[PDB]
Symmetry: C3
């Protein structure tokens, strides 16, 4: 009797799970919203400098109208290799945002010290990969208490991580010079200082890794193996040749209903082989609406979670009206940021600019009154942005990359408490000039020369 | 000199052969119609109870408009595993019909007794697979003389199996309680009774398998191996890692011309990569026209074969006019049944209901006069039905599943000799009310409450 | 720590490289046009007789409108096996043209004698493959100096090989009887005559291979292994299981920009998953415009290269206006031939016939005045031709096959110095009858009975 080969089955549920971390796929938590969970772990925030600049160059005539295809290919070639390392070292990729990603090693408190060594080793191997293409890898690490919030409505779900370790990991990555691995103060306080050799960082308690200095009988493979005891989903035994246990998920309509809620419709269409793969990688003209909600205490999930859910319910209803979409949510700019996009697949519409502005104003008005929201800031920028699936075959997400994405984020940060827009949006909108105010030009982190910027004052 | 890997070649001919049994693929018989062949074997009829009910639930809002995709995924996950067992145990899957399938082990008369043991073992392993999802597997087995009929025209071919073993296998499966394996009387008469332990079945000569009771020196692998001598296409040697020898078929335009005639155009389009895969799995509104032809002796292929071919030639010409398609033909309801569908891919048309009724009347009028056809009955029902490819990658077919499919079949059986329709069809058709007669409500096997039923009396 | 499977990555650059020889993929030469390179090697020109005739038969009703699909499947089944042999024996496939291909073994002068033995062995194994389907394999071999010319503009590139060995290989193949391997005179002069047993060919210095007659201690595997020292891209070591080193190419935007210029837009669309695969294999009505440029010395690349580039620049600009495309360029008919097509994917347009004729006249007028071009001849024929991707998964190209392709080539050869057309083109064009002249019928190599032929005299 034969024992024939079992071909890998790429069921729709498996394809869906590529878009999500193990934290969600194997989380099986309540469908109630907001939902909050608390745990400890080590975070890694990896950023490829320089793709944002390459993006503009891939629109040029030398690319012969295949810029989007070339961009995604070269980006994914590099990001795939970073994803593989993270996964092989036992991490869970939580999210991609542009040319960066955030990974988590969730463990019990007693295991943080050892897992920090694992993650540093991983980081140094990732630093390794690229001595190549004007691009640099910067890595920030943090460790400690982490909260997760899941929010949404009956057909859409989103999650976010919250807390000091989350803020620290982004602060650490922002200090990295072009190839550094930076540890947060708490990470450094919890790590095995007898093996990790660091330099200090000016006016900073975070530190920079120089190298690992193992002791005499230390063997990293044996050490790693001990650490895998604490890794619930590390592929093993018959499945040790897989990059994710998620590749083995089996059809289950209840689970698939739950997971799909995290994924946008247009991506589900592709998964379901109802649209040609070529069409989700595009350089398309869009308007970014980058919404920031600041709270008194941005580390306190039980406080901020209800407020986020409240804001989300309104945000989603006005985006529906004005035809925009939430691409990503994350803690960023000392609060909760929503990266919204006007002109994604299926929503390229005339009067997009006007709509983006009216939507921004509405969200500003509403969110300003959610009582625990202290300040709302919204940046609106329009231009050609890369929209597509970034990552590895086994772990990837739809994201946006572009100078206008960065501009909208910087506007929102440098002009708090108001709705701002760039010149393209201003000049292209239907709206009368006196609905706007031309603003003082501010020198902004990583922004060459936006032309004039404006406040959208509204019909007031 | 290198000996490089030879990648599997999924030629169009191989993709076509997934849709057909070895009985056709390797049959090389005459293109003349009707064609009849006679042989012996063991039949297995496997039915998943409960998908028909799940179908209705996959239209509900909880499925977020991906019901067809979820349905097919969960169905195929389960059916694939059953197909694999059948194939590994040496069976030929003849046909899928909804959530059931029919498999054949063709052998010489002397080998029936041993092959029956093989098929029972297979059955018990399939019974095994599912202690899981409100779904149960019921299996009926028969053994003896079998006839095959091939019928059609110059561009379409169909086949069917005929005879007492064929009737017995469906009778046996209809008696199975929710997880039973039932043997037909003749199967029980031919089997190795010294190993097969059974309970009797009330008012029935068919029996129920409890277990296999092998003798002392018996080894099933060694036994199976002896049995493989009689299996012409059992994958072996270099190809022992394949589920079907058909996976090795090589391009051959003559053979492909012959095989394609069995496959619908829309499926050939997909095979030929002229349509997105996503589009053949759908929950779509259709009208089922279930045609039953009864003969004096439904086991006598040389009698009934010419009549079937005659009926087929007319059926296909009126379906062409009224825009319907034959989905399946099989012996069922004490005669030859044609499962016809209005509104398949490419044939969603306005006035579908009217057309389905006019077509039914025409077929009724014509087939009533084919002299060896004793009675014609036709049931017509309209609603949302699952249309898509069911089975395993290596062996699968386009089929329909739905409460309205079952209703049309039950109408045709419980209201013989006339054309009947359900309320949706009646209410939605163009036709005047006096073309119909409201009928007495009958309590019908596996039907909750159809609203009123009607006879289509016609313009008479 | 796991070492998980690395799935093959079919990046766009790898898919592009399937369409090109190693001569281009790994050539890294100047983007300046014309560019010329000089080297030595052995050429093999392999032709499948009989597909051109099968093409007409695949339009018949027996193929049930899947003729294009059946044709390509059976063609590629056979051509794939020939491609595999060529590649395993270390050859570079340069180009496909219809049902023929041209392969190169580039080596230093001292290695020609040994590599000729390798290529003969390959040839005899290819002769081997087909004792099968009215089809025969004819092979011509040549060896010596070869020149390469690359020509084009800022977004399109083409290459061609030039010289006596190039002319000899096509002459050798034209003398092959239905299964022969023929050596050019120079090939025979350079080969190891002590192992190669030949018959002479009447009124010819080329010879026919009967067999290899190795000496006593000769071992072909050991011999081949020595020869692989001279093969720069022979897959080896970890990659010895690959048919091409090109399957390992990694993303590189500079290289991809360069390579894509050789590939037509419609094929790039498919590579980029922006169109269903099914659509590039078609039997479509087209007009072939076969342009031949004769020079004084067709072996002298530094002479003819500037002229070809000049002609190309005009040809491409008028084809753009009249909506045609260059499918292939090669040395053929004692000069440089351009195989142009009106009605490819995306360019099916009304008044195609007229356009093809106006374009032909324009090209004739212009190219006649490029001073080193001695004579221009252009044949124009219209009919159903097979258009699609021919070859192996790892090495394939878009090409055309059809009786009208052959007719246009034969017209251009047998009616030099003028623009000619067939009856379909004449009868179907918009143009007045007196723009044409009916011509004497000539008996033409491999052409049954074109109806009348005409000169396109023009408005003169
Ligand atoms: Cl997050
Ligand atoms: Cl998000
Ligand atoms: Cl049947
Ligand atoms: Cl059927
Ligand atoms: Cl060439
Ligand atoms: Cl070419
Ligand atoms: Mg970045
Ligand atoms: Mg059923
Ligand atoms: Mg040829």
């Amino acid at each position: 009797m034969n024992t024939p080969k079992e071909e890998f089955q790429d069921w729709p549920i498996v394809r869906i799970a590529a878009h999500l971390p193990d934290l969600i796929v194997y989380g099986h938590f309540s469908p109630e919203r907001p939902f909050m969970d608390y745990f400890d772990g080590v975070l890694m925030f990896v950023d490829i400098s320089g793709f944002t600049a390459m993006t503009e160059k891939f629109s040029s005539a030398m690319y012969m109208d295949r810029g989007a295809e070339q961009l995604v290919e070269i980006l994914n070639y590099h990001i795939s290799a970073i994803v593989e390392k993270v996964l092989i070292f036992g991490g869970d990729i939580l999210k991609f945002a542009g040319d960066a990603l955030l990974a988590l090693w969730r463990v019990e408190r007693k295991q943080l010290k050892n897992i920090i060594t694992v993650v540093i080793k991983c980081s140094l191997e990732i630093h390794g990969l690229f001595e190549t293409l004007d691009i640099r890898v910067k890595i920030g690490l943090a460790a400690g208490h982490i909260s997760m919030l899941v929010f949404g409505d009956e057909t859409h779900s989103h999650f976010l991580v919250i807390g000091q370790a989350v803020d620290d990991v982004r602060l650490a990555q922002n200090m990295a010079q072009m190839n550094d691995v930076i540890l947060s103060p708490n990470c450094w306080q919890l790590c095995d200082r007898s093996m990790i050799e660091i330099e200090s960082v000016p006016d900073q308690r975070a530190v920079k890794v120089n190298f690992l200095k193992p002791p005499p009988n230390f063997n990293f493979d044996e050490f790693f193996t001990k650490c895998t005891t604490f890794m619930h989903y590390y592929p093993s035994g018959e499945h040790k040749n897989l990059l994710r246990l998620a590749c083995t998920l089996k059809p289950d309509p209840e689970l698939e209903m739950s997971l799909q809620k995290y994924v946008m419709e247009s991506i589900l269409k592709q998964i379901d082989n109802k649209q040609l793969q070529g069409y989700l990688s595009e350089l398309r003209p869009v308007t970014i609406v980058f919404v920031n909600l600041m709270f008194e205490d941005q580390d306190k999930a039980e406080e901020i979670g209800p407020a986020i859910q409240d804001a989300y319910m309104h945000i989603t209803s006005v985006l529906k009206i004005f035809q925009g979409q939430i691409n990503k949510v994350f803690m960023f700019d000392k609060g909760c940021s929503f990266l919204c996009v006007f002109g994604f697949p299926g929503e390229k519409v005339p009067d997009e600019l006007t709509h983006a502005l009216e939507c921004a104003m509405d969200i500003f008005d509403f969110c300003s009154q959610v009582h625990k929201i202290q300040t709302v800031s919204i940046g609106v920028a329009s231009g050609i942005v890369f929209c597509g699936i970034v990552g590895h075959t086994v772990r990837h997400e739809y994201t946006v990359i572009g100078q206008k994405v960065n501009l909208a984020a910087r506007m929102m940060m440098y002009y708090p408490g108001i709705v701002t827009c760039d010149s393209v949006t201003y000049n292209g909108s239907n709206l009368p000039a006196y609905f706007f105010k031309e603003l003082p030009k501010k020198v902004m982190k990583g922004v060459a020369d936006s032309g004039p910027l404006y406040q959208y004052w509204g019909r007031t």
